[PDB]
Nucleic acid binder design. Structure first.
Ligand SMILES: [Mg+2]
Ligand SMILES: [Mg+2]
Lengths: 297, 504, 500, 299
DNA sequence: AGCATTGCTACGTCT
DNA sequence: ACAACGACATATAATTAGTCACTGTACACGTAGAGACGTAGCAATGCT
DNA sequence: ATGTACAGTGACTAATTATATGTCGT
DNA sequence: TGTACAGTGACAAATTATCTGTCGTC
DNA sequence: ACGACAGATAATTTGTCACTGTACACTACGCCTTTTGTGGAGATGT
DNA sequence: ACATCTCCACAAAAG
């Protein structure tokens, strides 16, 4: 009955194409969002080129339930602040069930055209692609929160959907610890620990707090595709995966780095190497054999 | 901290399937029957579902998935025998002793009998006791090193000073290794493997120059690689090059191992002359920048050639000596094609964007000056101290010499420079105003006609005294003019000389 | 041809259980009606069920399971590039060359550029194509050999003849191994690893004797092993042995590695004088009855001793020369105790019924004759085509000699026998009635106050002549008496003749 | 109903204690058989120390389906003519697959025992230590046919037990070749082919027509424990297993060895080797170490 | 007168 | 009769071929050769 | 904080294409 | 039919951790 | 309800024994370089 | 009658 009872999870594919930092054409991202039933409030979002499998929804859960920390680059007016453990969740593999179970809320899986109507559908490259994925992250959290969430609802227009949701919480929305919500993260596995507790990830190099005790061992990683600047490392066991430490990206030139940016860095590094002509490096190979073809003992 | 469930077995999925059904909000008037409709599909009594939901709340998904017994991995032989087994294996593998578990178990048998213990542990337990110890002793072999990353680099001197390598030629590095090809004389008989010497830019990571030859690691070999590296490169159409080895100029520092050739006075005097400091690495690991091109050569070149000898005694091909056919001039003509057209054109493995030569040509503060090659040679010549003595004579290695101004300087020590390949024309230097000044070429009297190498001048002098002969310019000449009266060292040197003499 | 179904999956069990549920017989008109339950159970039309019945009634469990595809293991690059890859790799790895799949891919790319091929095989395609070759040549590396079983055995010889082994002492074997122990002189500098040469009874798998020493593989070493093998054994109370090494007596054959001392004249002289026939080993494997005890003895003994040196350079433990601590008067005692109190009583690996020792004592054809010790010390090394002088005098290796009975003979071809370790005297032999007969014992001129060995007298002759000294036994003896081998030989001087 | 219509499996545990072919006590066997529920005759039968289980049941089922024969030491006056699949096999998951392979219904969840147990076995000197599982073969396989099945019951048409069988067919079974149902045999998961096609099994060595080409590869065996003197070698595919070769034991004194005898033969070697008076042999190891510990380093 | 034997030196060749 | 094997055209999906980011691992002077015992070159120191 | 870096690997993914399916067919 | 010992798989015997009952007031 | 008595039951280790992969196949302390303090004349000066 | 310096030849560690 009350707002915050059943949480809807929605998907769409954004008909705006993007360009990469170095000018490569990106795809069109999928948008996934978590919204109330009885308010129209938006409480969670993820956007990217990952297909709307269990991945983007598992992150969009994590997005909502934690405290909504935000950056200055967003130029936000409003604190989003929408923490709170859900209790029912509703979506279009099974992994969502394990999360719902472990977090103790029923998952009983089987409106975005508001942004199709809005000028959002007219930014460059809609429907010269002069925008990138980090720019969408900064602007879209703002243009949703400060404008599409804080405004008066389409019907029951006596309340803004945020405030209809905020007062309607059966008591007060309760945040919960961050580190227990790692199951919602991405996963990478069988990474190997180098001298001093070191790890490679996405062509970057990482180092841990106490990870040097397990050099030569192998470990799994989890991360957000929004800032890989520190990623969680866990020791694998037979039926338990135990969190060991954070590990910190090293040698990067910025305070923040999205996964898409590590892909772009690699893709520029890779695409540079692809342009080098082997013409000399190749012709010497047949000429070495044509010489050795004269050998007889 | 967080414990994550993974690899849930299917009965744990059944436990999940009830838990995800009980997650529907319920009360005592609803729990009892909504539990019982699960108990029937668990097919076990209600109280077990109570303990299941208890453990589920107590620990989550890792509560409903069973944890191995407290006894797993812990032995029942007890504290005395667990120690005695591990004590005995541990003492048996220090020094070169290599006592394996079976010999330990045989000790355990002896120990129980003398202990009057009627139930010694079986060898399977002893092997299971040591299995984790053996694995810990194994893992130590595998632990990987991260390596340096990006542009910024330094090299770890045994002085304890990390020398930053800020630009091209800032530190060159040099080492030698035995090539894994058996060579042959031009007549085709086996010549034992050569030595390869490499000089490498630590930035840019170009190979700057090499010397390939049968001569063992020696300051004259070092000096020979240094000459090639510092000088510009020219190669004729018999080298079918498509690239060009456009690298030259002096290092600012020179980084080495502790070999007696590198720790030689000769090399340190070259460094003082040419203008670089000589630094030694702590250990070979710090040398990896130069140790590694050998393996990239070993894999990509020497292994694909007739008579590859294999990197180990356990790995020499069964017929390396049968297949041996390349000569020193032929292997060098390939190795130069590899370095010019291939290795230096590959990406630098830190950088990805830049070929090893483009990371050189672009990374020079200024294009080096084209060194006058006689000046390089003059400061590559080794040198000794002797005093001009009466009549302007000076002795050096039993020979006597003089030159156009010597006798005026009779009575004091002079500095003179000599090339072990031809000692017959010494260059002699005075020190005046505490500065070095050239006097003249001192020619070996009566030998100003054809070259004499230092090695026979030593070896003749050793053996000629078994004849009781007087040692003099003419008698050592008389001991040289009939050396045509063949053997490996003759084969090597005549082949090794015969490679370079095409230069013009 | 029988073929059996394997890896029966859950879905195969689902498909099987419905098949079994329609294996129960009924009239065909209801048969075609009760099978309709399969339709939603399999989510497919009954025409597939009719096909499934046609498979199962034809093929059993094998055809009820899905096959692999027709293109499994077939490379879509086509026969040109798959030929090209396997051609290039095998010729690139002939002889000592060792090309690798990465090097092959460079050849593929090179040839494609020549061919103007728009899409040549990727390196991982080239790597895949070679995986069968690498695996097939890997399995060919490690094939176990069955080995002989039971009492019957025969040993192949380099002659091609195969010689049965029928009773204990029928066929002895020997070879030498370099011991994996660094061991040291008195007080003890590192010296070097010794050699071990062993006599092995091919019937009993027993071991009748060894020679352990720094001496290189030489006929004097083999002879001194046989001197140990053939004689009765007595070891001093300082060994404190529990068991007695009761193996003695003489071989009817000596089967051996083809080493130059085993092929020597001296040993062949022993063959004639003791009656065994020397037989050569064809290839090392045929030696296994003596090759393997080096492995057994390395593992159970040398690996536990301080100076252990590992099985190879590539495994050589760096502390070996840092704390080598045994001398050979200890390593002898360790090796002798290991043989006599353990190895002799150890079970023979394919009999089980009895120790190594009892298959000797029960297996010999009859009790052998225990020969006089002096008779083997008459089986000395001999020299021939020499001549006696026309007088009471003789010569050998620039030594000069006297003999009590030689004056009854003119200068004539003579045969003579000598102890290389006591060349102070010679035994002289004559060819009477085409048979060797004793002339006399003989001595170096005036030599009685001291004793001389052959090796030091040979070395002395080099420094004697090169100095221009007047050649004689008088001057030669001085160059004997006026170091690695000195330490080694003076260790070997420690001998049971002073201790028994 | 018919003599091939409905066959029922049965089992018993024997009340006799056995000694090996040397003279040591083994156990009391398990015993199992199938009986045609139409004719009521005892046909396929298995005896041994392996306890009743799907492998033993399947082995006795082979002993029913396959044409029976006897060795030259029996040449018995009475014999089974039983062979072929039933329409239904009764023993009331592995037994489902054999039925699905051969095409007969498998059911699982008056008996004769007293005609042997009380009438014969209780009379033997070893009844519940001085007869052997080679001998307890004929002391069953003879009497079960030469007396029991040769007996007549007027309760079922006044004919010998097997005469009703061979009379009672709606269509007479054809014999099935041995090669058609190795699925009833034992299994060995891995064996390595040694050089020259040799293969060790049960401490014996085997060789066979084409096995040497598989040297250095792994093969599976199937075998009959009543005589292991033949074994069958199988090669596993992606999801099939193909009959590779037969193989024959080398170096046997007598070409009849059973699995039970090979175990007891190998237990002789084990007991002989274990008889070593090793306690006098340990003195080497402790005094070798004492010597090496007496050598202190020079520095 | 003649050689005739005696004590080195290869050049393998093998472990 | 109609439930038996064809005749499809179209999915269905399991094969191969290709892209990448990881990582183990040898590069660290090292076996050509010591050290026996011939068949065959030799000198010599005798002597008839 | 950082030895070196290439060949071989794994974990997918795009393209191929072998062949399972559903309907009609006789 | 090389030799054959140390290490290892599959299993049975023994130990013993802990989890399943029938239960008692909560 | 949960959890709390004594005892079941799925592990856990202890111990057997058929099997097999491997070394034994002799083959590192040895080749080569450089420094260097001690030592023998032997021209020359005192 | 003496003292002096100089040039050339041998044992210990590292690759
Ligand atoms: Mg070096
Ligand atoms: Mg040998």
């Amino acid at each position: 009955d009350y707002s915050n009872h059943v949480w809807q999870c929605d998907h769409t594919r954004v008909d705006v194409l993007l360009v990469d930092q170095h000018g490569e054409i990106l795809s069109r991202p999928w948008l996934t969002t978590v919204i109330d039933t009885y308010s129209r409030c938006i409480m969670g979002i993820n956007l990217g080129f990952d297909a709307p499998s269990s991945g983007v929804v598992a992150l969009a859960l994590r997005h909502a339930i934690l405290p909504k920390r935000y950056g200055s680059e967003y130029k936000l007016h409003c604190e989003w602040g929408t923490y709170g453990k859900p209790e029912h969740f509703y979506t279009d593999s099974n992994h969502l069930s394990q999360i719902g179970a472990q977090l103790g809320f029923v998952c009983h899986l089987r409106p975005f055209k508001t942004l199709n109507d809005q000028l959002f559908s007219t930014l460059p490259g809609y429907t010269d692609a002069r925008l990138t994925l980090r720019e969408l992250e900064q602007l879209l959290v703002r243009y949703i929160v400060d404008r599409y969430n804080q405004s008066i609802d389409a019907r029951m227009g006596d309340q803004t959907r945020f405030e209809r949701w905020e007062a309607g919480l059966p008591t007060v929305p309760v945040p919960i610890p961050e580190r227990d919500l790692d199951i919602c993260l991405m996963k990478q596995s069988r990474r190997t620990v180098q001298r001093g507790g070191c790890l490679q990830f996405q062509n970057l190099m990482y180092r841990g707090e106490y990870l040097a005790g397990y050099a030569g061992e192998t470990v799994n990683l989890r991360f957000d595709p929004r800032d890989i600047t520190t990623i969680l490392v866990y020791r694998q066991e037979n039926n338990q995966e135990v969190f060991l430490t954070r590990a910190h990206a090293q040698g990067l030139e910025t305070e923040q780095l999205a996964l898409d940016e590590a892909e772009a860095a690699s893709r520029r590094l890779r695409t540079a190497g692809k342009t080098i002509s082997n013409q000399s490096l190749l012709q010497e190979v047949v000429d070495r054999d044509a010489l050795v073809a004269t050998k007889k003992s | 901290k967080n414990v994550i469930a993974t690899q849930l077995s299917e009965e744990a999925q059944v436990k999940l399937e009830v838990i995800q059904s009980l997650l529907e909000p319920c009360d005592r008037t609803t729990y009892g029957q909504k539990l019982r409709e699960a108990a029937e599909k668990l097919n076990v009594s209600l109280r077990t579902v109570q303990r299941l939901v208890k453990n589920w709340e107590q620990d989550g998904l890792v509560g409903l998935t069973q944890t191995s017994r407290a006894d797993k991995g812990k032995h029942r032989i007890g504290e005395f025998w667990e120690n005695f087994i591990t004590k005995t294996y541990k003492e048996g593998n220090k020094g070169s002793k290599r006592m394996t578990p079976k010999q330990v178990a045989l000790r355990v048998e002896a120990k129980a009998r003398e202990l009057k213990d009627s139930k010694p542990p079986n060898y399977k337990t002893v092997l299971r006791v040591l299995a984790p110890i053996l694995e810990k002793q194994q893992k130590a072999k595998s632990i990987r090193s991260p390596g340096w990353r990006g542009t910024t680099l330094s090299v770890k001197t045994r002085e304890g000073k990390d020398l930053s390598v800020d630009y091209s030629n800032h530190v060159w590095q040099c080492d030698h290794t035995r090539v894994d090809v058996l060579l042959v004389d031009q007549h085709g008989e086996i010549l034992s493997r050569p030595w390869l010497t490499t000089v490498i830019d630590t930035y840019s990571r170009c190979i700057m120059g090499i010397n390939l030859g049968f001569d063992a690691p020696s300051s004259g070999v070092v000096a020979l690689a240094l000459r090639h590296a510092i000088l510009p490169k020219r190669y004729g159409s018999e080298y079918k090059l498509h690239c060009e080895w456009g690298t030259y100029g002096k290092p600012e520092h020179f980084y080495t191992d502790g070999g007696k050739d590198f720790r030689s006075n000769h090399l340190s005097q070259i460094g003082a002359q040419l203008g670089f400091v000589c630094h030694l690495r702590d250990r070979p690991s710090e040398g990896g920048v130069v140790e590694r091109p050998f393996k990239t050569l070993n894999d990509q070149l020497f292994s694909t050639l007739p008579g590859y000898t294999g990197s180990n005694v356990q790995e020499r091909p069964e017929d390396a000596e049968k297949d041996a056919r390349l000569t020193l001039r032929e292997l060098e003509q390939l190795l130069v094609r590899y370095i010019v057209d291939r290795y230096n054109q590959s990406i630098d493995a830190r950088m990805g964007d830049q070929t090893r030569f483009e990371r050189w040509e672009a990374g020079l503060p200024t294009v080096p000056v084209p060194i006058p090659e006689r000046d390089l040679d003059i400061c590559l010549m080794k040198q000794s101290r002797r005093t001009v003595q009466r009549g302007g004579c000076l002795q050096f290695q039993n020979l006597m010499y003089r030159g156009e101004y010597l006798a005026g300087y009779a009575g004091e020590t002079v500095n003179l420079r000599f090339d072990p390949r031809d000692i017959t024309t010494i260059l002699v230097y005075r020190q005046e105003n505490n500065q070095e000044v050239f006097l003249t070429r001192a020619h070996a009297q009566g030998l100003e006609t054809e070259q004499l190498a230092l090695d026979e001048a030593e070896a003749a002098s050793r053996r000629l005294r078994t004849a009781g002969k007087t040692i003099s310019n003419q008698s050592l000449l008389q001991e040289v003019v009939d050396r045509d009266a063949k053997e490996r060292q003759k084969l090597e040197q005549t082949v090794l000389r015969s490679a370079a003499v095409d230069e013009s």
